[PDB]
Design a protein around this ligand. Structure first.
Ligand code: HEM
Ligand SMILES: COc1cccc2c1C(=O)c1c(O)c3c(c(O)c1C2=O)C[C@@](O)(C(C)=O)C[C@@H]3O[C@H]1C[C@H](N)[C@H](O)[C@H](C)O1
Length: 400
């Protein structure tokens, strides 16, 4: 069954709607052929249970050399490092080389080590929000939280966790996007900061995020160069703030639309964040996978080399398994989602994103209890192009 469309097609959206291709795909069946953006066929998985099988099947590999020749330098979302850096990029390998990187990265997201930074995370959020409110005091204009908070906050957090002291969040976001795009196929001020974080960790037993990465990497590789560690934390910084800042704009919009009870205990906050995660996934599809061998799944025989996507955004809003999927219901069955992926490549950073989301909400409820939208929720719009994360066009709010 085939639907001759680009699955990344996305017009301007309201808060409530999801693009129509998701329904078109799902009605066609569990495994649908589509027009890959960079040329040739591709296949979308539209059922949650079969998606979880695909993501756990060793025959669907990340290996980007298996991508069609035409895509190189063309496809928006082809992650292809130079072959010498692939062993150091979590998203480009599978099997033993991948478990090696997983063993190095997991202790960096230790829940106790992360929780020790809670106050610091709340301080960063508090400062950013206070200056935005004061700026509104001065100007008589609303604060724009997408440009002013959503990306700045997680970027400042991850940099501080890695020991990279950042002074200009906007400029650091620009600079790390250049390096990220080079690594996956003026930044010198940022490069010096990362190299310094790496020097400091090689020299001090202070158990920063960069130090645990270095200790484990040195153990797993015998020897690791500064360039290889800089390249790895560059990856964490991008992944650590782009998906998160896109999602935080949606979470902020739901909180300020008044949908959270003012008496909410920690369980209720958790259920609210989970429902935001089901309802507003930043990443609509999993990263490209390729059949390393001919595989027959969901009744469809897939050829060797078949590009395969799991539909995160569609399965998250599938009416066969969610009651009123396009309505925001914190107290629904807090239940299955693919917002963070599944299987061996499940998001290693999820713990940090959950801590940041709770902490942000706590700073808002405590110090900005009257914050609210400055436009109606029905006037909010979001979009995405190609392979980038979904994001709101703007989020004007009165913080006080
Ligand atoms: C709300 C925030 C986030 C969302 C929605 C999200 C989503 C995802 C998804 C969907 C994947 C798997 C993609 C695939 O297998 O096709 C993934 C993997 C990953 N994420 Fe997250 N992510 C978030 C936050 C973070 C943060 C804060 C970090 C680090 C600071 C991070 C680092 C990573 C890394 C390194 C991987 C690769 C894991 C692997 O391939 O083994 N993410 N994420
Ligand atoms: C020098 O870059 C790296 C070096 C080593 C490891 C890494 C990276 C890296 O850049 C990187 C990422 O950029 C991303 C991720 C990641 O794990 C890494 C590394 O591990 C995770 C991510 O794909 C998802 C889906 O959450 C988001 C993000 O991808 C970007 C590009 C994707 N194609 C997609 O557009 C996504 C939304 O943003």
């Amino acid at each position: 069954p085939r639907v001759a469309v680009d699955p990344f097609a996305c017009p301007m959206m309201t808060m409530q709607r999801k693009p129509e291709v998701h329904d078109a795909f799902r009605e066609a069946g569990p495994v649908v052929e589509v027009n890959a953006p960079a040329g040739g066929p591709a296949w979308v998985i539209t059922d949650d249970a079969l998606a979880r099988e695909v993501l756990a099947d060793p025959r669907f590999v990340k290996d980007p050399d298996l991508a069609p020749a035409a895509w190189r330098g063309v496809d928006d979302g082809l992650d292809i490092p130079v072959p010498e850096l692939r062993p150091f990029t979590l998203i480009a390998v599978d099997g033993e080389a991948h478990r090696r990187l997983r063993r190095i990265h997991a202790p960096a997201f230790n829940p106790r080590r992360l929780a020790e930074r809670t106050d610091r995370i709340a301080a960063i959020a508090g400062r950013l929000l206070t200056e935005l409110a004061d700026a509104s005091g001065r100007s008589g204009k609303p604060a724009e939280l997408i440009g002013g908070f959503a990306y700045h906050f997680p970027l400042l957090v991850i940099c501080e966790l890695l020991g990279v002291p950042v002074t200009d969040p906007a400029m650091a976001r620009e600079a790390v996007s250049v390096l990220k795009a080079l690594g996956l196929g003026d930044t010198s001020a940022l490069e010096s900061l990362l190299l310094e974080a790496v020097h400091s960790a090689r020299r001090n037993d202070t158990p920063t995020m960069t130090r645990v990465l270095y200790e484990r990497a040195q153990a797993e590789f015998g020897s690791v160069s500064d360039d290889q560690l800089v390249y790895m934390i560059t990856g964490l910084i991008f992944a650590g703030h782009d998906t998160t800042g896109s999602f935080l704009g949606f979470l902020l919009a739901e909180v300020l639309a008044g949908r959270l009870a003012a008496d909410a205990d920690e369980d209720a906050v958790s259920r609210f964040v989970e429902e935001a995660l089901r309802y507003h996934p930043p990443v609509p599809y999993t990263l490209w996978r390729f059949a390393a061998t001919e595989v027959t799944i969901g009744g469809v025989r897939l050829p060797r080399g078949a590009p395969v996507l799991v539909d995160i955004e569609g399965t998250n809003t599938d009416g066969r398994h969610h009651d009123a999927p396009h309505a925001f219901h914190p107290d629904r069955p807090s239940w299955r989602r693919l917002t963070f992926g599944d299987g061996p490549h499940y998001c290693i950073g999820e713990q940090l994103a959950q801590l940041e989301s709770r902490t942000m909400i706590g700073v808002l409820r405590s110090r900005f209890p009257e914050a609210r939208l400055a436009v109606p929720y029905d006037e909010l719009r979001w979009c995405r192009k190609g392979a980038q994360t979904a994001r709101l066009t703007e989020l004007p709010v009165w913080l006080r």
